[PDB]
């Protein structure tokens, strides 16, 4: 009945989605090849049903280079995906925003829109789009800004959820990141309803400290982020004592149209040996998720204020001690809310405990809390990233690649003043209001 | 898909390439006869990028070997690894350029440049997407430098919307192989900085020192020398030949490392470099690899980085690791060595990781640094060229075959401009 | 059904025909003794077009070998492959024409034509349903050119409602075999234009270059030179000799190709041509086949198409392909090379596909292009003939055996008119 389609662009989107879609097939008890060895619909929201017993996902894998899609085609999850939907280009954008948004990205945007239209007409009650795109890449940043323009015009007013990968302050794999991030934010600031952010190093501290892991491959990092991705859409696919659907997050976490940049968090996240020496009660996973060191973005909450929050419990959860736990949390003076939001908590309970994939770093837990915080503390990260952009742009470094691929110098000025307006507003509303 | 054309000019390019296709063949499991004898299927997933599928599962490299003299091809054709090249590609002239620019760009080059260019257009019509051209040549010879520049200007006309890399062998500051080096090199650079996207400058004495102290070899011939430069040259490409956690390609490297159109001269480097005997006393792990590349000793260009500052840096890892250990060290390198990096490029480290290790090694790395210390190399060459030109020495045989006085004036006028901006940006605030 | 008559004149015709009937015998699985030894019944499906059924399952060709000088015939009779011809067909005169038109049209033309016309009539009556005539001759000799014109005329009043194909070896620009070429050529061409349907002009030195360059043969003799021209000639006919997916016949070629009565001079070409050693490094595929055909180098007539425009073009494939690949590639050729095609015939590509591949090849093709590059061939011949005639050289021995000056004046006037109309239609809007 209720439908949402998932778009994976760039290498980040395809690699994350390989693990994200690896977990849904386990929650719904479907084999990788579509067969079968709570169950009574449920899967209609993600897994479209073919006449036979096989289910195929509603995914659209699009990339400009074929190096990573071929891994998916030849991977273990080969018979699952619909072969047509795996759209490949020929060469990537080479970490150039101009290439993947003007010259080469334009030549393939019509093909992906064709499969979007065919997938939407096949469904009935479409609600919105889930986009898993990075920020520093070429086909994950420039190409996805084009898709927002194409999707928004076709479908007027639908929730557009994005699961970004926020560029790290100290960790940086690309050299031209400040040019890509500033450009992609200025254009998606108006076509996005809420954009969850994740920092790559933030999981590394979490994986080193809490997980007690010295082998943090990208598989281990990607396994952990997918748990947040699945549990946000956990109420759509499963019944719950206080159900929350995708439309609530738009009206519960977005006080202003521009300030729609929350950040994710998961709890409990502990190892297998440490599982024995922990009681794992509701009163502590609420405390664990609110601790500063468990946040999944490299920004400390103590320097800022929580604009709004959202918790999504699941499993053996009673709505009483959950009420009590937030009661003490609000009383505690470590965390401070904004004055004009007397109530700043939204809760959702579900009866299905989260599952654990075989061989995962995490341990099986009967309860789980996934916290999405819209906070002022993310404003510090914007100002820093803006500092890098004006430093590089001062010398006009790397500019010649962009201007030679279909941009003018005047465009770079407009994206700069736009981020100035967003940053000043992010703190102007966060300061006390007189009277 | 994303095929690239490999061009060899001069004796060095043919000699480097003769051993370059050695390492490429082992990576793809290719017998010297030309038939696949490998085991893993992953090798054939992207085999068309370099090799060309043919009848009865035979593979033919996409190579164009050209020299103005027949003294080079006699070795490759008659010698081993010569039964798999296509004989149409074996282009050769009659008389060598004789260490003269004029006899390779004006008089003798024009006769044979039409034959090779027609092969280039014919070369990969079967090839369906050009990714770029790969050129290996020398900056000291006549045919390697003279017609090699002639090809670059002509090829650029036919494929303007394409990127190419030239893996040149820049001259030495201690021992000079040929007497008229500065006339040949400076005339080449005045044309290279206009029709190329990036250039990998490589020395020889720096390769001699590395093969002497680090590898513990007292008598390294040219066979043991070219093996070191083949691995670096194969390291840059292997990003798009094999799958990796964070992939890269030829187009990706050009964007990160060419901040300005004229500042596109790089300096490579490889690690680990350990002797066979002393390989049991070291633990193969990421910690030493990042430290190994960033010291002045293990650098393939004889220019000490301590007199300059890195502008941008690559680290194209291989093998298997965790990107955390990679970026934990790039953090340690950045913090402890922050005095050797330019201020007005934040986070100037580009890292890519592959999944296929090199042969007989758990992990390895390739370092490419668009450092400012090159400015001291061009300063020396422009110093040698100046001393020779006022005396008009060796010049009576350059104007006698096409050139004149005015051409030499502009080449040096442009070259001092290049070293001016290569330093004015370093001291720019 | 649709039987074809093959006529040979001059030394060239007998030598070309000797290689011709060699190819056909292998194609139809015919032993040199004349008995069927092959396996497939597909060859027997249409065997009466060339061969003739006889007693005890013997097969004899429908060929009429005839030449004034006897010297050629003792070679074909005493040599191999002479046990299957018809002894009545072995017509020969007493003395050669001596490179004279007059001795080939008035003196010895009288008595020999009456004898050869008799065998034609007997051969025609034996035939079930005549399709056309095939004449192979040269425009430089005396007997082949002089008598062949007489035979073409005498046949013409006899069978008005028929077609014929003349595969003539047109003289070369670079090298000339005989001193008095232009007198025989100009007279011969004037008569042929009057009373012939189509004509496939073929050069010698152009096929000399192809054998030396492409096939890389050091010593190209007449054995190898005539072998290549036979394969083109066998390819043209095999459309109706063998079944195919898009069949064609001699009638189809004549109408598709000849837009005007006076413009019927074609230029053939064959592909693939690969050496014995270099066949393993090439992929036998339709892309390279069409590309190999459509370049000036692989053309059997010494006229570069780049100076002119293709009026109409044919392409008779062989083997097994896809019509998609065939016609997709004709689109790629037409779009890329559109500047070289006449504007006022659209879609000027005729394609036919057979099913039986040529011997020892996966697939092949034959290209017949009625172009405007012949205008440079006729212009040169007219220039050579003009200068020689104005001083009245060698004329006393054409006037002394029947002709006079009025024939020479009218032949030159007609040839000037033909090249005038040929050019005026190329430059039409
Ligand atoms: N969490 C996570 N992040 C990744 C992963 N792979 C790459 N990234 C991020 O992606 C960024 C690189 O940009 P990408 O979007 O991957 O570039 P791309 O997808 O190859 O597209 P192009 O830029 O056009 O080549 C890096 O900064 C990484 O932080 C992954 O497996 N997991
Ligand atoms: N790395 C490496 N460099 C070489 C090798 N052989 C020669 N060189 C370099 O190449 C230069 C020789 O000039 P070439 O470009 O080879 O000249 P050539 O190809 O012989 O043609 P001419 O200039 O006409 O003589 C010398 O300065 C050497 O430094 C080699 O085997 N390995
Ligand atoms: N393709 C090809 N052409 C040939 C060959 N032999 C001769 N020719 C050409 O044929 C011409 C010879 O003239 P012919 O008509 O054969 O003269 P002939 O048969 O000796 O008798 P006469 O005309 O009386 O001299 C020469 O100009 C050659 O160019 C051959 O073996 N192959
Ligand atoms: Mg990419
Ligand atoms: Mg040489
Ligand atoms: Mg004769």
Residue numbers in the entry:
A (entry chain K): 1 to 37, 40 to 42, 47 to 441
B (entry chain F), C (entry chain B): 1 to 429
How did the manuscript describe this experimental structure?
Microtubules are tubular filaments composed of αβ-tubulin heterodimers, which adopt a pseudo-helical geometry. Microtubules switch stochastically between periods of growth and shrinkage, a property called dynamic instability, which is critical for their function. Microtubules are stabilized at their growing ends by the so-called “GTP cap”, a region enriched in GTP-tubulin as a result of delayed nucleotide hydrolysis after GTP-tubulin addition to microtubule ends. The structure of the microtubule lattice in the GTP-cap region differs from the one of the GDP-microtubule, allowing members of the end binding (EB) protein family to selectively recognize the GTP cap, binding there with about ten times higher affinity than to the GDP-tubulin-containing microtubule shaft.
